[PDB]
Amino acid sequence: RCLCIKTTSGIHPKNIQSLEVIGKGTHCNQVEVIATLKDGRKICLDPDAPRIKKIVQKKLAGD
Amino acid sequence: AELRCLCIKTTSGIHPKNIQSLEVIGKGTHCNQVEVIATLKDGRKICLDPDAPRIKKIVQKKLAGD
Amino acid sequence: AELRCLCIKTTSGIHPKNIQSLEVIGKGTHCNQVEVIATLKDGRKICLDPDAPRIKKIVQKKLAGD
Amino acid sequence: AELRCLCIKTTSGIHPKNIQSLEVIGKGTHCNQVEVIATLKDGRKICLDPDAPRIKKIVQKKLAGD
Numbered sequence: 001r002c003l004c005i006k007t008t009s010g011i012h013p014k015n016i017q018s019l020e021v022i023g024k025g026t027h028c029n030q031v032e033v034i035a036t037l038k039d040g041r042k043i044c045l046d047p048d049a050p051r052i053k054k055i056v057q058k059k060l061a062g063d
Numbered sequence: 064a065e066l067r068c069l070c071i072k073t074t075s076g077i078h079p080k081n082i083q084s085l086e087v088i089g090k091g092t093h094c095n096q097v098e099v100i101a102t103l104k105d106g107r108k109i110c111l112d113p114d115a116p117r118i119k120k121i122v123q124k125k126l127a128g129d
Numbered sequence: 130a131e132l133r134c135l136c137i138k139t140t141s142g143i144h145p146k147n148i149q150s151l152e153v154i155g156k157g158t159h160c161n162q163v164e165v166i167a168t169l170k171d172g173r174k175i176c177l178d179p180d181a182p183r184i185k186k187i188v189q190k191k192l193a194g195d
Numbered sequence: 196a197e198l199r200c201l202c203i204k205t206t207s208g209i210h211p212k213n214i215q216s217l218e219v220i221g222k223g224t225h226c227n228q229v230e231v232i233a234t235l236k237d238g239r240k241i242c243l244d245p246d247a248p249r250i251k252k253i254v255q256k257k258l259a260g261d
Binding site: 148149150151152154155156157162163165179180185188189191192 | 222
């Protein structure tokens with residue numbers, strides 16, 4: 001079932017090395033967004049937060 | 064840095080329904096470009112063009128579970 | 130927070146066949162424990178117990194391509 | 196463009212203290228070999244040799260978090 005127990009939306013570009021977007025499925029009704037930080041740690045981001053939607057579009061532009 | 068950039072060749076032609084997960088690697092020092100790797104339903108992995116409008120579209124839709 | 134592990138809950142029972150890849154993240158300033166995140170063939174992710182002999186044996190069989 | 200095996204080249208010599216994480220990718224659709232990628236504390240990625248005893252050993256110590 002869902003990996004992501006808690007989801008943050010208060011983070012800025014810089015610490016994020018990569019992001020992984022997992023689509024909803026029979027074992028999780030929510031989309032999961034896992035960010036890999038420069039330090040190797042992982043955090044779950046809220047996929048609906050407009051802030052987080054912005055962060056993705058930027059990483060995607062190389063900005 | 065033995066493993067550098069994974070996607071020198073990309074694609075814009077992917078059917079969103081074949082996509083299971085997406086990984087967006089940001090510009091790093093080791094790979095000075097953004098790489099986007101889609102894992103397909105059958106396990107295959109393909110490099111996507113981060114700049115193609117369509118790909119930007121598909122990412123935003125996946126994110127919204129649209 | 131200071132302690133921000135991702136793996137709150139851990140399992141020891143998964144059958145090797147369902148595992149695609151595994152990531153082992155060492156102890157850090159922000160996480161007092163070793164985290165093992167398994168990526169299943171369906172794209173689902175689950176935290177494994179690094180201390181469980183069942184788990185150590187799975188890692189070894191994966192490595193051996195066994 | 197399709198992504199198969201990431202590791203053209205491998206090494207059996209890394210010092211454990213430079214390793215921040217390890218990813219073990221089992222044999223799959225598009226890569227009929229096991230691949231081990233270490234992410235160093237400086238973010239570089241190195242392909243490790245999964246058959247080399249020294250590597251098999253590093254993985255188990257990283258698991259035990261020793």
